[PDB]
């Protein structure tokens, strides 16, 4: 069980995707962190620069981590388990079509999935869970965490 021993964690959006405005990217990320906050003791703080616990970036193919992305579709992003350095960081494939609609792919939902990994959760076999290996659109307007995901952060933190 890798987990954060601290409860206030900072994050930094290193770069942006040109497909969305910055406000939309910052909003997608903010809301994604709030789904976890409301079901756990974690507080997320955004820093405009400096070293953050969780770095967020949009990278392409080879991007320095031995986990090369793969062009459109296929893997959409990845995140690292709780830890120092690359630990906790979440990378998104810059070659995907990021949206904030029902069109593939919706950034808030992929960010919400990735942040689960950053907090120590693995994939779930429950197709209704957000932590399920494959993406599926779910309305995001007043989106809330599936019970399985809630069971998951609750088991690591409290």
Ligand X SMILES: C[C@H](NC(=O)[C@@H](CS)Cc1ccccc1)C(=O)NCC(N)=O
- Which residues sit opposite 56 in a β-bridge? 13, 90
- What span, in angstroms and rounded, lies between the C-alpha atoms of 109 and 118? 14
Q: Rounded distance, CA 35 to CA 43, Å?
A: 11
Q: Give yes or no for residue 67 binding ligand X (CB under 6 A).
A: no
Phi, psi (deg, nearest 5) at residue 58: -105, 105
Q: Which of residues 53-72 bind Zn ion (CB under 5 A)?
A: 65, 67
Of the two residues 4 and 115, which places its CB atom closer to ligand X in the complex? 115
Residue pair 105/97 in contact by the 8 Å Cβ criterion = yes
Nearest-approach distance from CB 151 to Ca ion, in angstroms? 25
- Name the nearest CA neighbour of 8 among 56, 55, 53, 57: 53
Is residue 46 within 8 Å of 53, Cβ to Cβ? Answer: no
82 makes contact with Ca ion (CB under 5 A): no
Distance CA 79, CA 121 (A): 10
In the list ligand X, Ca ion, Zn ion, none, the entry touching 88 (Cβ below 5 to 8 angstroms by class) is: Ca ion
Q: Is 26 a catalytic residue?
A: no
75 is a site residue for ligand X (CB under 6 A): yes
Near ligand X by CB under 6 A: residue from 76, 121, 145, 153: 76
Query: Does residue number 29 form part of the binding site for ligand X (CB under 6 A)?
Result: no
User: Which residues in 13-72 contact Ca ion (CB under 5 A)?
Assistant: 70
Catalytic residue among 24, 95, 114, 139: 114
Q: Rule CB under 5 A: which residues touch Ca ion?
A: 70, 74-75, 87-89, 93
> What amino acid positions are annotated as catalytic residues?
114
């Amino acid at each position: 069980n890798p987990k954060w021993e601290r409860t206030n964690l900072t994050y930094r959006i290193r770069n942006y995707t040109p497909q969305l405005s910055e406000a939309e990217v910052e909003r997608a990320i903010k809301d994604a962190f709030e789904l976890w906050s409301v079901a756990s003791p974690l507080i997320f703080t955004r820093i405009s620069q400096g070293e953050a616990d969780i770095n967020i970036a949009f990278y392409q193919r080879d991007h320095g981590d031995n986990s090369p992305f793969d062009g459109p579709n296929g893997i959409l992003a990845h995140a690292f388990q709780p830890g120092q350095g690359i630990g906790g960081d979440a990378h998104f494939d810059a070659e995907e079509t990021w949206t904030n609609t029902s069109a593939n792919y919706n950034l808030f939902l992929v960010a919400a999935h990735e942040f689960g990994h950053s907090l120590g959760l693995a994939h779930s076999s429950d197709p209704g869970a957000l932590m399920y290996p494959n993406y599926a659109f779910r309305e995001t307007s007043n989106y809330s965490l599936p019970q399985d995901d809630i069971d998951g952060i609750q088991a690591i933190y409290g």
